[PDB]
Amino acid sequence: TARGTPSRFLASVLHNGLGRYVQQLQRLSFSVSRDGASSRGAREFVEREVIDFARRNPGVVIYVNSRPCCVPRVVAEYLNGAVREESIHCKSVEEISTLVQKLADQS
């Protein structure tokens, strides 16, 4: 509900559309299990989409730690000091790519 959840007003970071559009996404941190099914499609993401996505927007830093993890992770850190961590456990390549585009598109 809305009385149990805190609310805010619509705003921007530093008037993001006035002079120029600044990509508000600093970073992204996948942790990818080399041997593990849970990061399986995520591995294929590292095989196929992450290079093209990185060349699509040079203002974003992408780290793949490739540690022996059990749940793979994307960490979208932003210009205003906000960090949003999401799990890419057992999700397909195209839908992970849409999630990454969601992370890049937002503030």
Partner 1 sequence: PYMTREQERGHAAVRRREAFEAIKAAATSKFPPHRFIADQLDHLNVTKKWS
Partner 2 sequence: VKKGFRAAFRFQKELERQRLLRCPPPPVRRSEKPNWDYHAEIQAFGHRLQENFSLDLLKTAFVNSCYIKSEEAKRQQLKSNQELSEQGTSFSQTCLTQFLEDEYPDMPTEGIKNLVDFLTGEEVVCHVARNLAVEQLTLSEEFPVPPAVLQQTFFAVIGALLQSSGPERTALFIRDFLITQMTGKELFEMWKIINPMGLLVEELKKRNVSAPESRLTRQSGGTTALPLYFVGLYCDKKLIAEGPGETVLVAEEEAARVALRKLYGFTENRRPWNY
Partner 3 sequence: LRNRVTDRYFRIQEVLKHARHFRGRKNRCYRLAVRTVIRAFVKCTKARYLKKKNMRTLWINRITAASQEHGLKYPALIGNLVKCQVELNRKVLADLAIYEPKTFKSLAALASRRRHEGFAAALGDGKEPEGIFSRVVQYH
Burial class (CB in 10 A: 0-12, 13-18, 19+), 31: buried
Q: 74 touches which of partner 2, partner 1, partner 3, none (CB within 5 to 8 A by kind)?
A: none
CB of 52 to partner 3, least distance (A): 38
CB of 72 to partner 1, least distance (A): 13
Q: Which residues contact 80 (CB under 8 A, 6 or more apart)?
A: 13, 24, 107
**100 sits in which H/E element:** helix 93-105
Q: 1 touches which of partner 3, partner 2, partner 1, none (CB within 5 to 8 A by kind)?
A: partner 3
Q: Select from 2-10, 13-21, 40-48, 58-66 the region that touches partner 3 (CB under 8 A).
A: 2-10
CA distance 76 to 39: 18
How many other C-beta atoms can be found within 10 angstroms of the C-beta atom of residue 88? 22
Among residues 4, 6, 17, 81, which is the contact residue for partner 3, using CB under 8 A? 4
Residues that bind partner 2 (CB under 8 A): 13-15, 18-20, 22-23, 26-27, 29, 58-61, 63, 65, 75, 79-81
